[PDB]
Amino acid sequence: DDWEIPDGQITVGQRIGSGSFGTVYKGKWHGDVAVKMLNVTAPTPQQLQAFKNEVGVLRKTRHVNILLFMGYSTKPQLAIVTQWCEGSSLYHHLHIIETKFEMIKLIDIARQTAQGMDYLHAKSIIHRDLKSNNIFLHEDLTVKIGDFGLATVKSGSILWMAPEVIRMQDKNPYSFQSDVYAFGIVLYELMTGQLPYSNINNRDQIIFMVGRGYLSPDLSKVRSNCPKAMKRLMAECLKKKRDERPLFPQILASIELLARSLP
Numbered sequence: 245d246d247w248e249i250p251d252g253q254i255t256v257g258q259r260i261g262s263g264s265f266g267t268v269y270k271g272k273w274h275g276d277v278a279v280k281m282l283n284v285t286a287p288t289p290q291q292l293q294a295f296k297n298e299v300g301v302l303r304k305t306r307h308v309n310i311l312l313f314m315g316y317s318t319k320p321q322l323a324i325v326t327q328w329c330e331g332s333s334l335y336h337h338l339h340i341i342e343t344k345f346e347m348i349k350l351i352d353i354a355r356q357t358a359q360g361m362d363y364l365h366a367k368s369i370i371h372r373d374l375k376s377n378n379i380f381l382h383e384d385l386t387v388k389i390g391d392f393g394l395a396t397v398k399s400g401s402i403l404w405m406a407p408e409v410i411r412m413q414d415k416n417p418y419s420f421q422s423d424v425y426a427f428g429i430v431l432y433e434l435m436t437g438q439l440p441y442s443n444i445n446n447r448d449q450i451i452f453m454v455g456r457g458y459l460s461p462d463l464s465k466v467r468s469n470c471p472k473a474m475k476r477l478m479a480e481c482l483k484k485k486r487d488e489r490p491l492f493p494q495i496l497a498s499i500e501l502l503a504r505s506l507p
């Protein structure tokens with residue numbers, strides 16, 4: 245298959261954010277789309293190789309809970325195109341507008357997010373930048389997992405980084421478990437309506453402490469009706485040492501099981 249999208253086809257619109265390799269806009273191409281895109285046609289083989297790699301990953305993802313890849317432009321500017329999510333990111337809902345989701349919808353947002361990752365990890369893909377920001381909500385109902393900028397087979401966003409990633413020896417601290425840890429921090433975002441470590445106000449300290457294992461999210465901050473199995477599961481994903489964290493299959497199952505025992 246060739247998903248290259250010929251020149252002239254796209255009508256690019258309003259700015260949205262600065263994604264890993266460039267700038268996102270709303271655009272049009274057989275309907276509303278998103279277009280992540282590098283503004284310069286000065287594209288060094290560092291930029292032009294990242295792009296080639298993101299596309300290579302996006303083109304292996306066909307799942308309800310992964311953001312639908314649709315195609316790529318080379319000319320005029322480098323561009324990647326995806327489905328447009330009516331509803332914005334999970335970050336926006338939880339922290340910007342403070343949407344008070346029902347506890348069942350929370351558990352489902354978790355369920356679904358886990359499903360996407362599980363699918364991703366079976367396809368042998370490490371997302372490497374999971375976070376509410378990159379989790380998008382479709383008609384406020386369905387979860388779509390986003391920015392594949394960093395992502396691979398075989399960045400000033402710290403709060404979702406496992407300690408070994410904050411630490412650094414290997415060029416390869418990333419694993420399915422380092423993804424599990426970021427997922428851990430999403431469960432917390434969802435169960436607390438809050439980013440972790442708000443008592444601390446100094447970012448560099450957060451970095452140092454997490455990596456050492458002095459800081460770790462305050463689970464007492466969960467909502468009352470948060471099930472104690474969900475409370476116990478956050479703990480599994482947030483376990484300081486990578487080897488004690490469960491992979492997504494067992495996480496799904498646990499969220500599934502706990503969804504069943506539910507008022």
Ligand SMILES: COCCNCc1ccc(Nc2ncc3cc(-c4ccncc4)ccc3n2)cc1
Pocket residue numbers: 260261263268278279280311326327328329330331332333380390391392
């Ligand atoms: C305070 O109120 C603000 C109003 N919200 C505006 C709004 C609404 C919806 C979106 N939706 C949307 N929907 C999907 C999006 C996908 C990517 C994205 C990022 C990286 N790679 C591919 C796509 C990036 C941004 C995306 N944004 C954005 C802003």
